[PDB]
Design a protein around this ligand. Structure first.
Ligand SMILES: CCCCC/C=C\C/C=C\C/C=C\C/C=C\CCCC(=O)O
Length: 133
């Protein structure tokens, strides 16, 4: 079910990431560095366990989870959240909850590119990743 998402992906387009970060309360200096970073995202599976790595010159993260099972997560911007990842309409949907807030990180494949849509508050960021061979 998740298999077309698996692999190594490189950021190739970003829209409204500053809006998203600002909505989350990220400080200017961090936003500034983040806006010039091009992360690599690695998604791998081992049975029912998915591992999602995000690597850059600034911050790195790694999470492991089972689809449909809540997990604790500490995000790149240091939020301690309750998370769940599920497939919905063929999209990989990641929901984070903390302090009564929510944000969604939705991944979908369009023409072989991975489109990540980040929503918090009214801010909607779209980032596009291409597969590395
Ligand atoms: C480890 C993330 C590396 C790239 C971004 C650089 C710095 C992170 C700093 C702040 C960003 C604020 C919120 C983190 C939440 C989502 C970022 C996902 C970006 C992506 O997956 O495209």
């Amino acid at each position: 079910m998740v298999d077309a998402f698996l692999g190594t992906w490189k950021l190739v387009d970003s829209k409204n990431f500053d809006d998203y970060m600002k909505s989350l309360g990220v400080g200017f200096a961090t936003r500034q560095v983040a806006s010039m970073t091009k992360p690599t995202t690695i998604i791998e599976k081992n049975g029912d366990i998915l591992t999602l790595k995000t690597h850059s010159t600034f911050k790195n993260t790694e999470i492991s989870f089972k689809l449909g099972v809540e997990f604790d997560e500490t995000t790149a911007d240091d939020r301690k959240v309750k998370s769940i990842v599920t497939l919905d309409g063929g999209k990989l949907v990641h929901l984070q909850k903390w302090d009564g807030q929510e944000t969604t990180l939705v991944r979908e494949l369009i023409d072989g590119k991975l489109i990540l849509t980040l929503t918090h508050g009214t801010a909607v960021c779209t980032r596009t990743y291409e597969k590395e061979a």
